[PDB]
Amino acid sequence: MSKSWNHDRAAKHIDQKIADVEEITIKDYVRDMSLESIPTSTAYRVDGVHMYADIMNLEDMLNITAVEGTECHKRTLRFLDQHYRAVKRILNKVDARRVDFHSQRLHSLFTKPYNTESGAETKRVQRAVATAQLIIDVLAETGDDDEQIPAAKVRIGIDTGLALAVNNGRSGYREPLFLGDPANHAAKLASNNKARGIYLTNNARKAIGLAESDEPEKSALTAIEIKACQDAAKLDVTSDEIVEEWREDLKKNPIGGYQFSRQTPPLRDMDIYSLTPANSKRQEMVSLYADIDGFTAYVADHINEKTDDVVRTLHVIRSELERVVTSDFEGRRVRFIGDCVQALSCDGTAHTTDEEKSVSEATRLAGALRSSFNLAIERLNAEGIETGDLGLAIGFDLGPIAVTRLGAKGNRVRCAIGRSVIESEKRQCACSGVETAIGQVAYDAASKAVQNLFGKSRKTSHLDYNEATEALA
Ligand SMILES: Nc1ncnc2c1ncn2[C@@H]1O[C@H](COP(=O)(O)OP(=O)(O)OP(=O)(O)O)[C@@H](O)[C@H]1O
Ligand SMILES: [Ca+2]
Ligand SMILES: [Mg+2]
Ligand SMILES: [Mn+2]
Ligand code: NA
Ligand code: NA
Ligand code: NA
C-alpha cells in the first residue's frame, strides 16, 4: 500500500533497462516475417496504410443522463462490444491487422500487397478505403433497438507511410504497436470534427491519384472516389455477409449481462486479461494519461537514420513510467496507445473510493512520472543515446470507470471507459511537454492544496515529485 517515489530506485531500474537495450536490431518488414512477440531489442520498419475508425457517438452514450450510472455504463459497453465485434470480423475477413481499440478509436493496419508488387502502396490505400466503407455500411446495422443500442456514427482517417513496430507492452508482449507518423496522422483526421465520412491525408490522396487538399480534414472522399477504390480492391465481402455472421455469432454465444464489482485494493492487482462482461470491474477512480510529447516527430526524424536510439528511448521511458504507476503507486497500466501511457489510480477501501485522497495521490503520481521521465532523459543522454526534444504531457480526471474485455472469444480487446477517461485525455492534450492538467471533476473533489497547485487554469508546469510533495505538505 505504500505510495512513494525514490530517485535511487528509479535510477537503478532506468540503468538496468538501458543495459537491456545496448544492442538493437532493426529489420525491414517483408513477406514471411512476423510482427508477433517482437523482442525488446528488435524493431521492424513497416510500410503500411493505417486506418483509424472513430465511433463518434461514444460520448453520447456516456452522456445519456446527467448521472454517469451503472446502466449508462452497461449500455455503453454493449454498444462498444457490438460494434467492435463487427469491425474485427471485417478486418479478419480482409486479412488486415487490428492494432487496438482505444476508447472509441479503432486502429487497423494494411501491409499487403508488399512493395515487391508494382503499385503496392496504391493498392494498400485502395484496400483500406474499401474496408473503411464496408465498416461504415455494416455499423449502420449493428445496433440493437430492443436493447436501446444505437448504430455507430463513423468517421475514418487514413494515412500511408513508415512506422516502427515494437511489442505493445501488455498481455504477454505478443501484439505489436506502430510508432511514427501514419497512425498518429490517421487518428487526427478521424477525430478532427464530427462530420461523418472517409478522410485521407495528402500522402494517401496522392497514392490513389487524387488532388491534394489544403484542408484534408474537411475533404471527405466522394461516393465516386470510394467506388473507384472498391472496384480496384475487389474485397469480395459484402455488408450483408458481415451482418449475418455477426448476428449468428451473437445468437450462439451472446454477450450476456455486464456485471460489475470493485477491484480489491491495490488496483495494480486488477487482472485485466481475465475480465469478461460478466466479470467487469467498476469504481470511481482516476484516469491518467502520460504522453511522450514530441515522440511521433522524433520517430519520423529517425525512421531511416539512427533508428536504433528510438527503440532504446521508447523501452527505457515506457518501462520506467509503467513501473512508477504500478510499483511505486500501486496503480494499473491499462495499455500503451502508441507512445502514450493510459493508467488508473485509486484510493479508498474495498467498499468505497476516497475521492479527495485519490486525487491527491494521483497528483503525487503525476509528479513521480515527471521525475522519472526527467531522470530517464538524463541517463539516456549520459549513455550517448539521442532523445531529441521529448517532453511529457500528463492529464488526469476522476469519475466512475468500467474495465472489461469486449468481443467474441479469440477476438477480444480490453476496454476502460468513462467520462473521466475521455476527459483525462483532453486535459493531457491541452498540455505542453512540461505541463500537467487536472479535470474539473477531480479538481472539485480535491483538497485545497491540490486546488491551489492547479489554480484557475487547472494546469501547472514543472510539477515533479519534489514540487508535488512540497505543494501537498
Ligand atoms: N503511434 C501511434 N499509434 C496509434 N495511435 C496513435 C499513435 N500516436 C498517436 N496516436 C493517436 O493519434 C492521435 C494524436 O495523438 P497526439 O495528440 O499525441 O499527437 P501529437 O501530440 O502530435 O504526438 P506526440 O505526443 O507524439 O508529439 C491520438 O488519437 C492518439 O491516441
Ligand atoms: Ca506522444
Ligand atoms: Mg494553474
Ligand atoms: Mn501528444
Ligand atoms: Na494487410
Ligand atoms: Na509503493
Ligand atoms: Na495509486
> Which CATH number characterizes residue 320's domain?
3.30.70.1230
In 3-state terms the chain splits into helix, strand, coil percentages (rounded to 5) of 45, 25, 30
Helix H or strand E encompassing 3 = none
Residues 6+ apart with CB under 8 A from 321: 290, 341, 369, 372, 373
Residues 6+ apart with CB under 8 A from 77: 258, 277, 280, 402, 404, 406, 415, 417
In a domain, 38, yes or no: no
How remote is the CA of residue 428 from the centroid of ligand 4, in Å? 8
Query: Three-class SS of residue 255?
Result: coil
- Name the residue with the closest Cα to ligand 1, atom 12: 184
Residue among 235, 184, 182, 173 nearest 207 (CA):
182
Please report which ligand is nearest the Cα atom of 343.
Answer: 7
Same-domain pairing of 335 and 403 = yes
- Report the atom number in ligand 1 closest to the C-alpha of 99: 4
The rounded distance, in Å, linking the Cα atoms of 151 and 61 is 11
Same-domain pairing of 213 and 321 = no
- CB-based pocket (< 6 A), ligand 1: 105, 107, 177-179, 183-184, 187-188, 191, 291, 293-297, 337-339, 429
What phi-psi label fits residue 382: left (phi over 0), alpha (psi between -120 and 50 degrees) or beta?
A: alpha
- Name the residue with the closest Cα to ligand 1, atom 31: 337
- Distance set, CA 399 to CA 116, 341, 346 (Å): 50, 19, 11
268 secondary structure, DSSP code:
G
The rounded distance, in Å, linking the Cα atoms of 80 and 89 is 14
Q: Find residue 416's DSSP bridge partners.
A: 403
Write down the residue that cell numbers 500528463 correspond to. 394
Same-domain pairing of 281 and 405 = yes
279 secondary structure, DSSP code:
B
DSSP 341-408: EEEEE--B-SS-B-HHHHHHHHHHHHHHHHHHHHHHHHHHHHTT---TT-EEEEEEEEEEEEEEEESS
How remote is the CA of residue 27 from the centroid of ligand 3, in Å? 45
How remote is the CA of residue 133 from the centroid of ligand 2, in Å? 29
In a domain, 347, yes or no: yes
The pairing of strands 391-406 and 413-417 is: antiparallel
How remote is the CA of residue 452 from the centroid of ligand 5, in Å? 51
Residues 66, 110 contacting (CB under 8 angstroms): no
Residues across the chain: 473
Residues 6+ apart with CB under 8 A from 337: 100, 102, 177
Can you list the pairs that 22-27 forms with residues at least 24 positions away whose Cβ atoms lie under 8 Å? 24/308, 24/311, 24/312, 26/307, 26/308, 26/311
Q: Which residue among 234, 252, 270 closes a domain?
A: 252
Of 184, 425, 432, the one to substitute when testing ligand 1's pocket (max ligand atoms within 8 A of C-beta) is 184
Does the CA dihedral 356-360-362-366 come out positive or negative?
A: positive
- Report the atom number in ligand 1 closest to the C-alpha of 291: 25
The rounded distance, in Å, linking the Cα atoms of 363 and 465 is 9
Same-domain pairing of 285 and 377 = yes
C-alpha dihedral (135, 136, 139, 145), degrees to nearest 10: -170
Query: Three-class SS of residue 333?
Result: strand
Residues 221, 200 contacting (CB under 8 angstroms): yes
Neighbour count for residue 308 (Cβ, 10 Å):
18
Domain count, the chain: 2
Provide the residues around ligand 6 (an ion) whose CB is within 5 A: 2, 328
Same-domain pairing of 75 and 145 = yes
Same-domain pairing of 331 and 432 = yes
How remote is the CA of residue 461 from the centroid of ligand 3, in Å? 8
Same-domain pairing of 275 and 178 = no
The pairing of strands 154-167 and 197-200 is: parallel
The domain of 401 spans 7-24+257-472
Helix H or strand E encompassing 422 = helix 419-429
How remote is the CA of residue 296 from the centroid of ligand 2, in Å? 6
In a domain, 39, yes or no: no
Write b or e for each residue in 91-101: b if 16 or more Cβ atoms lie within 10 A of its Cβ, otherwise e.
Answer: bebbebbbbbb
Same-domain pairing of 226 and 188 = yes
Alpha-helical regions (H) of 208-265:
223-233, 239-252
Residue among 395, 469, 397, 377 nearest 432 (CA):
395
Please state whether the peptide bond connecting residue 216 to the residue before it is cis, i.e. omega within 30 degrees of 0.
no
In a domain, 2, yes or no: no
In a domain, 36, yes or no: no
Helix H or strand E encompassing 77 = helix 70-94
Query: Three-class SS of residue 160?
Result: strand
Same-domain pairing of 152 and 96 = yes
In a domain, 336, yes or no: yes
Residue 293, C-alpha cell as written in the block = 510529447
Neighbour count for residue 64 (Cβ, 10 Å):
14
Residue 115, C-alpha cell as written in the block = 512493395
Same-domain pairing of 234 and 346 = no
Provide the residues around ligand 2 (an ion) whose CB is within 5 A: 291-292, 295, 339
- Name the residue with the closest Cα to ligand 1, atom 10: 184
Residues 164, 310 contacting (CB under 8 angstroms): yes
Residues 6+ apart with CB under 8 A from 8: none
Write down the residue that cell numbers 490505400 correspond to. 125
Q: Tell me the CB-side half-sphere exposure of residue 113, using CA atoms within 13 A.
A: 11
The resolution, in angstroms to one decimal, equals 1.4
Residues 219, 199 contacting (CB under 8 angstroms): yes
Residue among 358, 391, 354, 359 nearest 373 (CA):
391
- Over the Cα atoms of the chain, what is R_g? 22
Same-domain pairing of 92 and 120 = yes
The rounded distance, in Å, linking the Cα atoms of 333 and 344 is 6
The rounded distance, in Å, linking the Cα atoms of 83 and 141 is 9
The pairing of strands 435-438 and 391-406 is: parallel
Same-domain pairing of 398 and 355 = yes
Amino acid at 180: G
Residue 160, C-alpha cell as written in the block = 500511408
Please report which ligand is nearest the Cα atom of 269.
Answer: 7
Q: Which residue among 221, 252, 283 closes a domain?
A: 252
In a domain, 373, yes or no: yes
The rounded distance, in Å, linking the Cα atoms of 45 and 33 is 12
- Name the residue with the closest Cα to ligand 1, atom 19: 184
The rounded distance, in Å, linking the Cα atoms of 455 and 256 is 45
What does the angle CA 82 – CA 84 – CA 89 come to, to the nearest 5 degrees? Answer: 100
Provide the residues around ligand 3 (an ion) whose CB is within 5 A: 455, 457
Dihedral pair phi/psi, residue 193, rounded to 5°: -155, 180
Please report which ligand is nearest the Cα atom of 267.
Answer: 7
Residues 6+ apart with CB under 8 A from 329: 3, 5, 345, 361, 364, 365, 368
265 secondary structure, DSSP code:
S
**Count H helices, E strands: the chain?**
15, 15
Dihedral pair phi/psi, residue 157, rounded to 5°: -120, 140
User: Using CB atoms within 10 A of its CB, is residue 269 exposed (0-12), middle (13-18) or buried (19+)?
Assistant: exposed
- Experimental determination technique: X-ray
The rounded distance, in Å, linking the Cα atoms of 458 and 442 is 10
In a domain, 29, yes or no: no
Q: Which residue among 252, 285, 305 closes a domain?
A: 252
How remote is the CA of residue 72 from the centroid of ligand 4, in Å? 29
Residue among 327, 297, 15, 307 nearest 166 (CA):
307
How remote is the CA of residue 184 from the centroid of ligand 1, in Å? 4
